[PDB]
Design a protein around this ligand. Structure first.
Ligand code: TFR
Ligand code: MG
Ligand code: MG
Length: 466
């Protein structure tokens, strides 16, 4: 039955959608170590978001499953009878899940501690990581979009998915001829607005564009929204995520009865502060719980923050240079051969990343027999699962196939780069696989990837749910 499988994958790989593409495909039985299929497995390819597999495993080795993240509010000394402080500091230490609600709860704690007036300025301290916001080879044209958000120690995460360093723009039509209404979300009064957008006639064509022009903190809205059209919402990144957090914190303080008399800006807690008074703190959920929104939806910002958190633990440097070496060592310490790996970031957004399909499968084996294996696999998207927090990037794929509910795999997609890697659990044995496509021209060869993943589920002894 093993020859039948080899013939089937050979035929799937001759799909015309893979014209001019190099594709690494490796399948291994983890119970035996048997190499069921291998094609260009040593070839170096861009992984896209399959890079997160390496990042996640390294984070669980370096930081541990029980690891959580802190944010604190600091003043030089406690407030007195008059309840006055001078300068106040919001200090972030790499929480990727810090919501506006959490800023509110910290504002309430600052009020309940006796502070009524912040007489000086309020500062956002994100010096726990460096101020290098973006990886060198990331494309400037990508910068307005959530997956390309700037990386900071102090950032506000949006929604239940915890998209960091962004704001929600909402555009609403008005009457035909009148300007569209633009709602900047959290970045209201932080980011500049350039609204050139108009409301078009009922039934006219939607031509609405929402942009942040490179190197500015301005949201430029252009084009035309039809009068009868549904409101358009989009996540856009801001410049200096910590400063936005600072902005949102002032609003939180002012709403909890604390007057801020000064300005909002960046600044680290001064060195000459003898014994800083912690007026409020927040602790995140543990890394095992954080891994879910991170891996399920493939959060880029989370990955880069984790890398720099690795840099802090291994070296006390919230730095790409440190964290990426930290990732490499952690993988080596796990039993993974890192020869074919080139690490340029944690998210896989960098086109300077390189993996081989063998290395991915190697990692999947070593991860499978690790103490944190269950929190590891619980994070991976599950083929065909309706629940977005279970299905993830695989939620609307492989439904009604042998793979549905069974295959746990990480996706990866950019221009000319597509990947699918994970496990096929079968009664006799757990299968591990990697599929990495580079150079194809159409859209991601998802049909090809799904066909292989389904055939392997069938091989492992599964049938399609009906
Ligand atoms: C993952 O594959 C990540 C790395 N990909 C993206 O976030 C999309 C990046 C777009 C880059 C753009 N310049 C291009 O199309 O090449 C995953 F799963 F998150 F998508
Ligand atoms: Mg939303
Ligand atoms: Mg505001």
């Amino acid at each position: 039955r093993l020859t039948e499988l080899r013939e089937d994958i050979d035929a799937i790989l001759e799909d015309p959608a893979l014209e001019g593409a190099v594709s690494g495909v490796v399948v291994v039985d983890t119970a035996t170590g048997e190499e069921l299929y291998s094609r260009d497995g040593g070839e170096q390819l861009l992984p896209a978001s399959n890079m997160k597999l390496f990042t996640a495993a390294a984070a669980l080795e370096v930081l541990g499953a029980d690891h959580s993240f802190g944010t604190e509010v600091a003043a030089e000394s406690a407030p007195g009878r008059r309840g006055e402080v001078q300068d106040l500091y919001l200090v972030g230490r790499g929480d990727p899940t810090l919501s506006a609600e959490d800023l509110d709860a910290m504002a309430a704690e600052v009020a309940a501690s006796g502070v009524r007036t912040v007489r000086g300025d309020l500062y956002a301290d994100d010096t726990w990581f460096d101020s290098e916001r973006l990886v060198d080879d990331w494309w400037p044209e990508d910068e307005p979009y959530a997956y390309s958000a700037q990386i900071s120690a102090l950032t506000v995460a949006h929604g239940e998915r915890f998209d960091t360093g962004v704001t929600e723009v909402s555009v609403t039509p008005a009457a035909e001829g009148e300007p569209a209404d633009v709602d900047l979300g959290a970045a209201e009064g932080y980011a500049e607005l350039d609204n050139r957008a108009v409301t078009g006639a009922a039934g006219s064509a939607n031509t609405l564009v929402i942009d942040r022009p490179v190197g500015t903190n301005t949201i430029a809205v252009t084009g035309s929204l039809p009068a009868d059209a549904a409101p358009v919402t989009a996540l856009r990144t801001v410049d200096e995520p910590a400063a936005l957090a600072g902005h949102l914190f002032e609003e939180a303080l002012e709403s909890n009865g604390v007057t801020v008399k000064g300005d909002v800006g960046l600044g680290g807690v001064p060195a000459d502060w003898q014994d800083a008074e912690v007026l409020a703190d927040h602790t995140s959920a543990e890394l095992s719980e954080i891994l879910v929104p991170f891996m399920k939806f493939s959060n880029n910002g989370h990955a880069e923050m984790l890398v720099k958190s690795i840099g802090q633990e291994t070296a006390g440097a919230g730095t790409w240079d440190a964290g990426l070496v930290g990732v490499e060592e952690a993988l080596s310490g796990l039993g993974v051969d890192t020869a074919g790996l080139v690490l340029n970031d944690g998210s896989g957004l960098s086109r300077g990343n390189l993996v081989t399909a063998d290395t991915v499968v190697d990692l999947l084996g070593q991860a499978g027999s690790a103490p944190w294996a269950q929190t590891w696999s619980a994070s991976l998207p599950v083929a065909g699962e309706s629940d977005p927090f279970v299905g993830g990037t695989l939620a609307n794929r492989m439904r009604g196939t042998a793979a549905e509910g069974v295959v746990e795999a990480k996706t990866g997609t950019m221009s000319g780069v597509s990947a699918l890697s994970g496990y096929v659990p079968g009664p006799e044995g757990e299968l591990a696989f990697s599929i990495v496509n580079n150079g194809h021209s159409g859209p991601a060869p998802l049909a090809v990837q799904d066909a292989i993943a389904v055939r392997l589920a069938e091989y492992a002894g599964h049938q399609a749910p009906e």
